[PDB]
Amino acid sequence: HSDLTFCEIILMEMESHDAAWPFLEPVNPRLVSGYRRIIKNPMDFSTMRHRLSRGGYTSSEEFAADALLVFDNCQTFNEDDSEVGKAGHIMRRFFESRWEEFY
Ligand SMILES: CN1C[C@H](Nc2cnn(C)c(=O)c2Br)C[C@H](c2ccccc2)C1
Predict the structure, then answer these.
(1) Is the beta carbon of 21 within 6 A of some atom in ligand 1?
(2) Of 29, 48, 72, 92, which has the maximum CB count within 10 A?
(3) What is the 1 CA–ligand 1 centroid distance (Å)?
């Protein structure tokens, strides 16, 4: 229970972060050419929110695996110096630093 209690804290903190704007909602493949071809397993914060809401996280490791998938997919598709990429690095570093502050 305290496992998923820390996940609520960090997801709420990521949900409200300045640099979270590329990750609050699923990428729209109709708007992003080549996205479905390149990104096999899309992931985003609202999908993690939904899954946390309906209780579909058994351990805290599953939650972190979805979070890292967001920034993996981000680095796979965007240049590090693009504006999404820049936001993803800020968000990736935030997540790891907060995650280690508990574990
Ligand atoms: C849903 N969400 C997905 C988009 N995130 C993106 C867009 N393009 N690429 C290549 C990505 O990797 C991501 Br994540 C950002 C979009 C938006 C948000 C704010 C302002 C402009 C666009 C709204």
Answers:
(1) yes
(2) 48
(3) 33
Contact 51, 57 (CB under 8 A): yes
The tokens describing 100, both together, are 């280690």
Number of domains in the chain: 1
Which of the 8 DSSP states describes residue 24?
A: S
Question: Resolution of the deposited coordinates, in angstroms?
Answer: 2.3
The 8-class DSSP code of residue 12 comes to H
Range of the domain at 83: 1-103
Q: How is residue 85 written in tokens? A: 């990429």
Which residue from 27, 41, 47, 73 has its CB within 8 A of the most atoms of ligand 1, so it is best to mutate? Answer: 27
Helix (H) or strand (E) holding 87: helix 83-100
Please report where in the chains the tokens 């570093």 appear, as a residue: 93
